[PDB]
XYZ file of C-alpha atoms in Angstrom:
752
model
C 43.665 39.100 -1.236
C 42.470 35.716 -1.152
C 39.336 33.949 1.112
C 41.700 32.993 3.680
C 42.892 36.411 4.633
C 39.348 37.113 4.393
C 38.538 34.542 6.945
C 41.973 35.523 9.294
C 40.640 39.104 9.308
C 37.401 38.059 10.442
C 38.955 36.153 13.256
C 41.105 38.996 13.947
C 38.468 41.178 14.671
C 36.947 38.169 16.636
C 39.946 38.853 18.984
C 40.552 42.497 18.975
C 36.625 43.890 18.666
C 37.753 45.455 15.185
C 38.964 48.294 14.004
C 35.358 50.090 14.824
C 35.421 49.659 18.310
C 34.513 52.665 19.823
C 37.073 53.959 22.582
C 34.145 56.625 23.633
C 32.051 53.172 25.189
C 32.429 53.155 28.991
C 33.041 49.757 29.049
C 35.320 49.043 25.573
C 37.573 51.975 27.051
C 37.480 50.015 30.872
C 38.438 46.908 29.083
C 41.078 48.175 26.546
C 42.785 49.716 29.577
C 43.297 46.681 31.957
C 44.202 44.997 28.842
C 47.268 47.129 28.036
C 47.656 46.975 32.370
C 47.912 43.404 32.218
C 50.104 43.253 29.270
C 52.721 46.052 30.954
C 52.607 44.062 34.084
C 53.954 40.827 31.988
C 55.966 42.836 29.924
C 57.696 44.297 32.857
C 58.067 40.999 34.805
C 59.563 39.281 31.697
C 63.626 38.197 31.200
C 64.346 40.051 27.705
C 68.156 38.769 28.176
C 69.295 36.295 25.369
C 70.719 33.647 28.000
C 67.321 33.320 29.730
C 66.137 29.930 31.207
C 62.478 31.456 31.552
C 60.252 33.930 29.908
C 58.779 34.521 33.479
C 60.226 33.489 36.728
C 56.556 32.604 37.951
C 56.295 29.985 35.320
C 59.872 28.782 34.698
C 60.106 25.080 33.916
C 59.251 24.112 30.492
C 58.413 20.925 31.476
C 55.382 21.448 33.143
C 52.614 21.810 31.003
C 50.839 23.854 33.186
C 53.276 26.591 33.171
C 53.886 26.765 29.418
C 49.975 26.614 28.688
C 50.130 29.741 31.203
C 53.401 31.493 29.403
C 51.431 31.193 25.863
C 48.183 32.680 27.364
C 49.915 35.462 28.997
C 51.618 36.281 25.198
C 48.190 36.116 23.966
C 47.139 38.651 26.236
C 50.105 40.591 25.343
C 49.379 40.136 21.701
C 45.660 41.158 21.904
C 47.265 44.603 24.254
C 49.510 45.244 21.173
C 46.536 45.384 18.343
C 43.383 46.048 19.913
C 42.397 49.121 18.632
C 42.282 51.502 21.434
C 45.015 49.977 24.017
C 47.702 52.281 25.241
C 49.799 49.622 23.630
C 48.236 49.331 20.242
C 51.143 48.832 17.298
C 53.832 48.733 19.933
C 56.775 47.656 18.111
C 58.940 46.501 21.066
C 56.182 44.747 22.404
C 55.314 42.793 19.252
C 59.000 41.651 19.179
C 59.219 40.774 22.470
C 56.644 38.521 22.058
C 57.867 36.899 19.076
C 60.873 36.340 20.554
C 59.633 34.819 23.705
C 57.799 32.532 20.965
C 61.136 31.231 19.385
C 62.851 30.509 22.854
C 60.139 28.573 23.515
C 59.988 26.509 20.232
C 63.438 25.600 20.743
C 63.517 25.592 24.168
C 60.078 24.061 25.347
C 57.138 23.411 22.557
C 58.249 21.497 19.660
C 57.894 18.308 17.875
C 60.708 16.757 20.012
C 58.340 16.286 22.851
C 55.543 13.352 23.285
C 52.276 14.132 22.097
C 50.662 12.598 25.092
C 52.996 13.750 28.031
C 50.869 15.346 31.084
C 48.935 17.017 30.761
C 48.206 16.378 26.753
C 45.437 19.007 26.878
C 47.850 21.924 27.205
C 50.156 20.239 24.721
C 47.642 19.737 22.177
C 44.819 21.745 22.812
C 45.615 24.321 25.428
C 48.818 26.099 23.721
C 47.732 25.727 20.128
C 44.500 27.670 20.985
C 46.828 30.760 22.364
C 49.572 30.206 19.881
C 46.943 30.307 17.129
C 45.387 33.517 18.241
C 48.860 35.157 18.417
C 49.649 34.167 14.687
C 46.649 35.486 13.785
C 47.072 38.829 15.542
C 50.495 39.561 14.653
C 50.620 37.720 11.548
C 51.871 40.955 9.416
C 54.729 41.103 11.782
C 55.680 37.185 11.575
C 58.275 35.841 8.904
C 57.929 32.880 7.386
C 60.763 31.188 8.931
C 58.701 32.227 12.086
C 55.482 31.121 11.008
C 56.800 27.500 10.177
C 58.057 26.730 13.809
C 54.468 28.126 15.113
C 52.560 26.310 12.855
C 54.694 22.946 12.095
C 54.432 22.569 15.798
C 51.007 22.784 16.233
C 50.196 20.711 13.348
C 52.710 17.768 14.781
C 50.800 17.881 18.033
C 46.974 18.530 16.638
C 46.731 17.414 12.861
C 43.671 15.767 13.288
C 40.469 16.005 14.359
C 39.450 12.301 16.257
C 38.322 12.698 20.071
C 34.782 14.125 21.204
C 32.985 16.535 22.579
C 34.873 19.592 24.051
C 37.816 17.751 23.009
C 36.764 17.317 19.773
C 35.267 20.731 19.297
C 38.548 22.222 20.552
C 40.465 20.280 17.980
C 38.334 21.491 15.645
C 38.979 25.249 16.336
C 42.702 23.967 16.670
C 43.231 22.599 12.964
C 40.941 25.246 11.509
C 42.323 28.526 12.931
C 45.740 27.144 11.756
C 44.069 25.754 8.332
C 42.870 29.421 7.892
C 46.692 30.954 8.922
C 48.683 28.489 6.630
C 45.802 28.213 4.099
C 45.268 24.782 4.050
C 41.602 24.497 2.035
C 41.662 20.839 3.216
C 42.551 20.495 6.521
C 40.152 23.888 6.660
C 37.309 21.313 5.488
C 38.216 18.866 7.728
C 37.555 21.660 10.916
C 34.471 22.189 9.295
C 33.452 18.252 9.149
C 34.465 17.732 12.937
C 31.673 19.826 14.480
C 29.393 16.929 12.872
C 31.186 14.327 14.606
C 30.375 12.426 17.990
C 30.072 14.666 21.256
C 29.201 17.963 18.862
C 26.141 18.334 16.384
C 24.458 15.133 16.764
C 22.327 14.172 20.054
C 23.661 11.462 21.973
C 21.538 8.770 23.263
C 24.624 7.453 25.479
C 28.230 8.733 26.619
C 29.337 12.606 25.962
C 27.361 15.124 24.347
C 24.306 16.729 24.405
C 20.821 14.951 24.679
C 17.443 15.361 23.252
C 15.927 16.222 26.467
C 18.424 18.847 27.008
C 21.103 17.245 29.191
C 24.675 17.581 28.729
C 27.186 14.962 29.489
C 31.005 14.477 29.620
C 33.400 12.060 30.393
C 30.964 9.283 30.295
C 28.957 9.727 33.561
C 29.073 13.572 34.430
C 26.264 16.119 34.093
C 28.559 18.564 32.306
C 26.484 21.511 30.624
C 28.283 24.236 32.616
C 32.107 23.386 32.503
C 32.973 21.263 29.250
C 29.384 22.172 27.963
C 30.140 25.811 27.810
C 33.492 24.807 26.075
C 31.664 23.204 23.442
C 29.373 25.903 23.004
C 31.728 28.659 22.882
C 34.483 26.918 20.202
C 31.255 25.800 18.271
C 29.730 29.139 18.220
C 33.257 30.927 17.366
C 34.186 28.234 14.681
C 30.584 28.013 12.955
C 30.650 31.883 13.153
C 34.190 31.850 11.377
C 33.289 29.598 8.613
C 29.837 31.245 7.999
C 29.663 32.446 4.430
C 32.699 31.218 3.551
C 33.476 28.067 1.242
C 33.635 26.165 4.552
C 30.437 27.341 6.448
C 29.304 24.599 8.066
C 26.110 22.507 5.976
C 25.184 19.969 8.549
C 21.523 20.081 8.672
C 22.505 18.971 12.643
C 23.750 22.579 13.274
C 20.140 23.606 13.985
C 20.454 21.194 16.840
C 22.638 24.394 18.325
C 20.038 26.307 18.718
C 18.001 23.980 21.009
C 21.357 23.646 22.880
C 20.193 27.458 24.225
C 16.827 27.181 24.463
C 16.432 23.573 26.271
C 20.043 23.096 27.708
C 21.407 26.407 28.942
C 18.476 29.035 29.232
C 16.692 26.632 32.234
C 19.848 26.325 33.947
C 20.793 30.109 34.034
C 19.496 32.193 36.773
C 20.081 36.214 36.454
C 23.698 35.725 35.092
C 25.056 32.636 36.968
C 25.529 28.816 35.276
C 24.250 26.428 38.011
C 26.941 24.863 39.715
C 25.175 21.161 39.818
C 26.211 21.123 35.992
C 29.727 22.682 36.058
C 31.252 19.657 37.673
C 34.869 19.737 38.928
C 34.849 23.419 37.664
C 33.117 24.581 40.937
C 36.354 24.350 42.367
C 37.915 27.003 40.094
C 38.193 30.513 41.404
C 38.281 32.035 37.836
C 35.188 30.446 36.925
C 32.166 30.549 39.762
C 28.446 30.774 38.632
C 28.487 34.186 37.060
C 31.775 34.451 35.748
C 30.639 31.249 33.748
C 27.313 32.457 33.012
C 29.036 35.453 31.263
C 30.797 33.226 28.931
C 27.317 31.437 27.846
C 25.920 34.664 27.027
C 29.146 35.677 25.370
C 28.659 32.633 22.999
C 24.658 33.127 22.590
C 25.892 36.922 21.363
C 28.177 35.032 19.382
C 25.672 32.878 17.841
C 23.235 35.539 17.112
C 25.519 36.741 14.699
C 25.041 33.948 12.148
C 22.231 32.291 13.387
C 18.985 32.101 10.995
C 15.659 33.671 11.627
C 14.112 33.849 14.161
C 17.157 32.339 16.343
C 19.212 35.555 16.048
C 16.748 37.750 17.257
C 15.749 35.245 19.959
C 19.333 34.755 21.270
C 19.668 38.702 21.224
C 16.335 38.700 23.095
C 18.089 36.276 25.395
C 21.347 38.030 26.136
C 20.007 41.405 26.651
C 17.807 40.069 29.454
C 20.589 38.468 31.278
C 22.589 41.613 30.794
C 20.121 43.204 32.662
C 19.130 40.667 35.044
C 22.958 40.405 36.308
C 23.232 43.203 38.845
C 26.361 41.194 40.981
C 28.893 41.481 38.343
C 28.858 43.520 35.113
C 28.626 40.954 31.863
C 31.207 43.638 30.063
C 33.358 43.003 32.912
C 34.770 39.536 31.818
C 34.222 38.396 27.955
C 35.824 39.575 25.022
C 36.066 43.269 23.964
C 34.316 42.125 20.574
C 31.503 40.418 22.619
C 31.347 43.929 24.420
C 31.029 45.645 21.290
C 28.393 43.095 19.931
C 26.487 43.181 23.137
C 26.116 46.742 23.466
C 24.969 46.732 20.044
C 22.118 44.632 20.965
C 21.419 46.351 24.414
C 21.207 49.843 22.715
C 18.796 48.907 20.546
C 15.166 49.824 21.496
C 13.664 47.284 19.136
C 14.879 44.487 21.184
C 13.314 43.549 24.038
C 14.473 41.300 26.740
C 13.390 37.852 26.572
C 11.010 36.306 29.112
C 12.428 34.810 31.991
C 12.273 30.885 32.062
C 9.419 29.350 33.905
C 9.111 25.748 33.930
C 9.820 22.764 35.575
C 12.118 20.787 33.744
C 13.510 17.129 34.384
C 17.251 16.406 32.751
C 16.660 12.619 32.929
C 19.971 12.282 31.016
C 22.160 13.588 33.870
C 20.186 13.338 36.830
C 19.413 17.070 37.193
C 16.282 18.608 37.953
C 15.563 22.320 37.777
C 12.492 24.764 38.805
C 12.287 28.016 37.492
C 9.523 30.644 38.639
C 9.398 34.673 39.103
C 11.772 35.554 42.262
C 13.485 31.865 42.251
C 14.839 29.235 40.662
C 15.660 25.668 42.571
C 18.338 23.585 40.841
C 18.288 19.471 42.129
C 21.372 17.310 41.737
C 21.034 13.706 42.332
C 23.413 10.743 40.945
C 22.833 7.108 40.414
C 23.927 4.144 38.373
C 24.280 5.958 35.309
C 25.567 9.361 37.054
C 28.546 9.945 39.518
C 28.549 11.303 42.470
C 31.094 13.849 41.433
C 33.970 14.100 39.494
C 37.604 14.753 40.970
C 40.797 14.507 38.940
C 44.141 16.889 38.232
C 43.915 17.668 41.955
C 40.371 19.381 41.447
C 37.217 19.330 43.682
C 38.567 17.440 46.022
C 35.833 17.738 48.266
C 32.637 17.894 45.862
C 31.320 14.466 47.678
C 27.750 15.769 48.147
C 27.481 17.997 45.241
C 25.411 15.707 43.497
C 23.528 13.643 46.463
C 20.173 14.909 46.861
C 21.574 18.632 46.634
C 19.255 21.384 46.228
C 20.319 24.495 45.237
C 17.945 27.967 45.938
C 18.582 31.136 43.664
C 17.186 34.210 44.808
C 17.920 37.896 44.596
C 21.118 37.474 46.220
C 23.116 36.714 43.109
C 26.325 36.264 44.685
C 25.200 33.087 47.362
C 27.604 30.581 45.480
C 30.074 33.040 44.019
C 32.486 35.291 46.189
C 33.960 32.212 47.471
C 31.173 29.666 48.644
C 33.235 26.526 47.577
C 36.108 26.979 49.499
C 34.616 28.148 52.705
C 31.218 26.071 52.648
C 31.722 23.271 55.069
C 31.600 20.092 52.087
C 30.135 17.785 54.391
C 26.947 19.673 54.777
C 25.091 20.561 51.261
C 22.216 21.482 51.516
C 19.302 18.704 51.228
C 21.198 15.775 51.580
C 21.486 12.699 53.958
C 24.781 11.566 55.433
C 26.902 10.199 57.826
C 28.550 13.164 59.456
C 31.482 14.533 58.771
C 32.103 11.509 56.647
C 32.978 11.531 52.660
C 32.072 9.176 49.751
C 33.924 8.178 46.535
C 33.640 9.651 43.290
C 31.671 7.012 40.880
C 28.486 5.867 40.215
C 25.725 4.238 42.654
C 24.119 1.089 42.485
C 21.004 2.198 42.670
C 18.980 2.593 39.273
C 15.784 5.081 40.989
C 16.821 8.079 40.030
C 14.973 10.680 38.260
C 11.205 11.908 38.079
C 8.073 13.285 36.348
C 7.190 16.364 34.612
C 3.929 17.781 34.724
C 3.093 19.183 31.429
C 6.420 21.236 32.285
C 4.897 23.475 34.757
C 5.374 21.198 37.820
C 7.057 18.098 38.609
C 8.798 15.817 41.614
C 11.907 14.133 41.331
C 13.805 11.195 43.946
C 16.696 9.657 44.331
C 16.746 5.765 46.065
C 20.234 6.746 48.265
C 22.690 3.741 49.500
C 26.670 5.287 49.515
C 28.926 2.811 48.968
C 31.644 4.435 51.288
C 30.030 3.390 54.122
C 26.136 1.949 54.908
C 23.261 4.380 54.550
C 20.212 3.902 52.589
C 17.372 6.298 52.627
C 14.389 7.488 50.140
C 14.656 10.869 49.028
C 11.829 12.835 47.228
C 11.368 16.708 46.034
C 7.966 18.313 44.901
C 8.097 21.044 42.957
C 4.912 23.297 43.248
C 4.102 26.660 42.875
C 6.273 28.826 45.382
C 6.946 25.193 47.908
C 9.164 22.683 47.853
C 8.392 19.612 49.905
C 11.164 17.598 50.795
C 10.756 13.925 51.892
C 13.062 11.552 53.652
C 11.734 7.720 54.691
C 13.668 4.389 55.331
C 16.776 6.040 56.569
C 18.686 3.284 57.943
C 22.388 2.650 58.660
C 24.869 0.236 60.329
C 27.690 2.604 60.087
C 28.155 3.626 63.695
C 28.103 7.120 62.408
C 25.644 9.531 63.221
C 23.045 10.141 60.314
C 22.095 13.748 59.598
C 20.046 15.662 56.482
C 20.869 19.202 55.668
C 17.760 21.388 55.593
C 19.841 24.510 54.563
C 23.281 25.874 54.733
C 23.522 29.567 53.508
C 25.984 31.973 52.962
C 25.055 35.148 55.418
C 26.088 38.822 54.949
C 29.803 40.012 55.956
C 28.483 40.643 59.723
C 26.810 37.204 59.455
C 23.312 39.125 61.417
C 20.716 38.182 59.059
C 18.070 38.180 60.963
C 16.383 34.792 61.571
C 13.052 33.776 63.122
C 11.649 30.101 64.475
C 7.798 29.544 65.279
C 7.484 33.374 65.664
C 10.523 34.105 67.906
C 13.267 36.051 66.776
C 16.804 33.710 67.363
C 20.449 35.327 68.307
C 22.150 36.797 65.330
C 25.652 36.025 66.855
C 28.482 34.457 64.961
C 29.981 31.219 66.463
C 26.880 30.035 68.134
C 25.234 26.889 68.006
C 21.628 25.907 69.054
C 19.114 23.461 68.901
C 15.485 24.159 68.223
C 13.325 21.575 69.572
C 9.461 21.855 68.610
C 10.112 23.631 65.281
C 7.139 24.334 63.136
C 8.468 27.058 61.051
C 11.826 28.777 60.741
C 12.699 32.524 58.689
C 15.801 33.391 57.458
C 16.262 37.049 56.217
C 18.264 37.414 53.044
C 21.567 39.326 51.944
C 19.060 41.793 50.200
C 16.148 43.875 51.432
C 14.039 42.036 49.202
C 13.894 38.793 47.203
C 16.115 36.642 49.557
C 14.603 35.665 52.425
C 13.921 31.555 52.700
C 11.218 30.158 54.965
C 11.309 26.552 56.106
C 8.227 24.534 57.169
C 8.210 21.400 59.292
C 4.913 19.384 58.942
C 4.278 17.936 62.404
C 7.294 19.719 63.676
C 10.864 18.844 63.742
C 14.105 19.164 66.117
C 16.431 21.250 64.369
C 20.375 21.369 65.042
C 21.726 24.696 63.945
C 24.734 26.897 64.135
C 26.005 30.161 62.759
C 29.650 30.632 62.189
C 32.274 32.093 60.351
C 34.384 29.873 57.947
C 37.937 30.142 56.638
C 39.608 28.531 53.698
C 41.352 28.657 50.408
C 40.648 27.834 47.259
C 44.161 25.850 47.123
C 42.092 23.568 49.033
C 39.971 22.292 46.716
C 41.826 22.944 43.815
C 45.307 22.008 44.679
C 47.357 23.633 41.487
C 50.235 25.679 41.868
C 48.565 28.071 39.961
C 45.213 28.154 42.473
C 45.451 31.360 45.005
C 46.103 30.288 48.923
C 44.598 33.485 49.897
C 42.562 32.761 53.149
C 38.881 33.943 52.864
C 36.373 33.975 55.514
C 32.499 33.421 54.976
C 29.179 33.232 57.410
C 27.064 30.515 57.290
C 23.938 29.452 59.033
C 23.581 25.981 58.754
C 20.710 23.793 59.934
C 20.336 19.902 60.033
C 18.273 17.148 61.555
C 20.048 14.720 63.358
C 19.040 10.826 62.995
C 21.530 9.763 65.421
C 23.465 6.883 64.838
C 22.389 3.629 63.154
C 18.905 5.068 62.591
C 16.155 2.411 61.442
C 13.196 3.625 59.058
C 13.882 6.840 60.205
C 12.473 9.889 58.284
C 12.042 13.544 57.427
C 9.677 16.385 55.565
C 10.125 19.940 55.166
C 8.983 22.393 52.672
C 11.193 25.224 51.210
C 9.570 28.796 50.895
C 11.298 31.014 49.024
C 10.689 34.924 49.020
C 8.248 34.864 51.896
C 8.538 37.373 54.891
C 8.444 35.946 58.472
C 5.040 37.059 58.856
C 4.121 35.078 55.711
C 6.000 32.096 56.877
C 4.012 31.863 59.822
C 0.687 32.582 57.847
C 1.827 29.602 55.993
C 2.103 27.381 58.739
C -1.239 28.167 59.920
C -3.016 26.837 56.996
C -0.202 24.881 55.227
C -0.694 24.480 50.964
C 0.886 20.913 51.161
C -0.264 18.051 52.824
C 1.836 14.688 53.343
C -0.060 11.952 51.547
C 2.611 9.486 52.826
C 5.972 8.729 53.483
C 7.258 5.306 53.937
C 10.020 3.190 52.129
C 7.473 2.345 49.552
C 5.613 5.609 48.506
C 6.403 8.959 49.017
C 3.431 11.699 48.047
C 2.703 15.415 48.509
C -0.684 16.627 47.378
C -0.837 20.858 47.040
C -4.788 21.629 48.298
C -4.750 25.107 46.256
C -3.427 23.531 42.794
C -5.154 20.482 43.110
C -1.664 18.402 42.680
C -0.562 15.267 43.768
C 2.848 13.678 43.121
C 3.621 10.467 44.250
C 7.387 8.215 44.174
C 6.582 4.677 44.166
C 10.088 2.718 44.951
C 8.990 -0.843 44.616
C 7.667 -3.129 42.141
C 4.736 -3.592 44.139
C 0.868 -2.834 43.672
C 0.719 0.751 45.739
C -1.577 3.670 46.436
C -1.155 7.252 47.432
C -4.512 9.016 47.519
C -6.194 8.844 43.961
C -3.059 7.289 42.531
C -2.237 3.691 42.221
C 0.772 1.917 40.710
C 1.899 -1.501 40.308
C 5.643 -0.546 39.704
C 8.377 1.865 40.327
C 7.490 5.215 39.241
C 7.266 8.846 39.519
C 3.634 9.972 38.851
C 1.874 13.444 39.037
C -1.432 14.205 38.571
C -3.424 17.763 38.590
C -7.169 17.943 39.254
C -9.561 20.871 38.038
C -12.749 19.625 40.150
C -15.583 18.511 37.862
C -13.376 19.787 34.465
C -10.188 17.226 34.100
C -7.443 15.063 35.688
C -4.008 15.538 34.459
C -1.642 12.949 34.702
C 2.089 12.548 33.821
C 4.098 9.029 34.615
C 7.846 8.474 34.157
C 10.056 5.137 34.883
C 13.253 6.635 36.857
C 15.156 3.334 36.433
C 15.195 3.741 32.477
C 14.988 0.061 33.041
C 11.537 -1.270 32.884
C 11.623 -2.809 29.580
C 7.496 -3.533 30.040
C 4.866 -1.004 31.377
C 3.731 0.669 34.165
C 0.273 0.053 35.006
C -1.733 2.998 36.660
C -5.055 3.477 37.994
C -6.787 6.704 38.950
C -9.567 7.027 41.369
C -11.769 9.105 39.502
C -14.621 8.406 37.044
C -13.682 9.950 33.473
C -15.600 10.818 30.406
C -13.125 10.840 27.811
C -9.329 11.113 27.304
C -6.372 12.224 25.067
C -2.944 10.814 25.642
C 0.865 10.608 24.739
C 1.396 7.486 22.451
C 2.873 4.978 24.857
C -0.207 5.164 26.951
C -2.720 2.922 26.647
C -6.180 3.597 28.267
C -8.030 0.796 29.207
C -10.532 1.947 31.390
C -12.344 5.607 31.959
C -15.267 4.250 34.761
C -15.775 4.083 37.625
C -12.047 4.235 38.064
C -9.429 5.626 34.991
C -6.907 2.462 34.400
C -4.030 2.696 31.773
C -0.254 1.267 31.228
C 2.736 3.282 30.137
C 4.832 1.698 27.644
C 8.086 2.842 28.988
C 10.438 0.357 27.263
C 13.719 2.428 26.307
C 11.723 5.766 27.433
C 15.043 6.798 29.037
C 13.269 8.521 31.946
C 11.020 10.753 30.041
C 7.365 11.478 31.144
C 4.392 10.508 29.606
C 1.221 13.117 29.683
C -2.312 11.849 29.740
C -5.501 14.171 30.156
C -9.032 13.018 30.875
C -12.288 14.724 30.852
C -14.569 14.904 33.740
C -17.825 14.923 34.296
């Protein structure tokens, strides 16, 4: 026994769950059964003949990387079914050998050094297949002759001998080289795998391009917000590799590894809601049926549980508290239902320990300046905002995936409440892709995948408790510009639109909301105190609307109210929509099964070729019909301004004033005066203090932002970057935003 053997065994346990994997545990046993059932299904459908042209008819074609990668995944499942203590296939000789025969046959007829390393899809050949093959080699190590292992490992070395890529691709490379290095016992290669994590897109914070940013954002493919997609993969791989090497001669020593803890607290936590990983950060992966928000969120908690196994104090303890909470929070899909059996074992250990208390739910407003995203987390709900600009692309669509992701990041609002299933349960293949909530578009018209020509995208954060965002809109596919803002307060999100103009000759509309209803599609809903019909297939216009109320899919915690300052005319419809995942993910493996979901869609028609059009609505989560009407009788927010120059909203109760200035000219909105493009929010406590935060959303002002507040102060404290020049009779200061990268600067003034 050497250290390599020790490592190999440690990885085996990570795959199998270990020798102490208790079969009495309801969930552990529930998993060790589906594993065999799936293996027997594959083992039964195999072609065990010696003249076979394929292992599985369903996956024939030794050239289509897609099918071959799937073949190796199946053989991986089978290997697991044969090595997981508790499987009704544990230690089966015929199964082990039938697997090794398949591998040899694949070596000679498909996966070998005679093929191009860069053939479509390079990912399968260099990362996908090797990751499965390495796992099979570890699991069936003892039943693998030297002759066989050579063909397996030599081939993997040919495809991925080194680590030289970035982000996920880089981390994936590390785990390929590392596990193999363990199997063949190459301390040099294992040292290189360890060192790979210090590379671009992983441990070190990115300031541009792919990687994790200091502000919490994550980007991949240069211009896409990807915390929930490639980010998840980077996390999982980095967590698995680090855990593997922890304590060994190759244990990660890079001090930047501590950044990983921050990824959890800053990059992932604010974007999780009762087990769901917000879709706005999952790129093209929203089009994958096997990766809807909760399934993905489960994988993220699985990594947290993994880190909790070796992370230093007090992170391990905190990770455990985080996982425990998410597991209890998610009553939609059992967490133990789709994570590794080893994750179940470790998870249960945390959940059953009384000394471990569930972490508190996040409560904040966060601006992810680096990826044009923003989130509001509160008790009972969460709002995610997806924007795009000259820096972040509208959406990503490659390899025939996410072809209808058009407006998923164009001022799109995502509301999370007690209806944990809203965005799962086949939402993406059935929702109207042209009517993503919160967006302003040319009816039934798409836009291109790419960055915009506007730099003004982002917002300001007030001490991480309240905030405001904005997106200067100007699509390239057709003519349509507008100023769009969102103001996040306690339990109200005010949305404002102005300068809505177009010469496209296409009806222009703004989507107030588009929600998936219950199976019957009969969610009650009301307008101005009057109930509206609940039937499906009914379109109807609501004119002179002050407020609307929609009942959620759950008795409590999922109602949504909508208040319209000044009243509005609403175009709506309630319909059953059918579609297939194949329609948004055109890959042979994608199920073509038809699914039907019900929706209540509401939008404002601005007509064709509007000029200076505008809208203003307030989202009121978790309020009953009675409460929405109560609000309407004395709304807490007050629109200060909604012109193409400035959009401002005031929240009477909290003393909050938010203002988005869109031009480089001196302008005023209530107490706030600005001389440049800026996102500003102030909070006033009568005769106590005046708080203020300011950002340069354009991330391009190389000078300052001159602000003036119509109040007289007695003193102040401020972030460096802010220089105060006057406190009386009015407040005056400048914010040095050169290279601020969209961050907010905070000042606090003492009032007499």
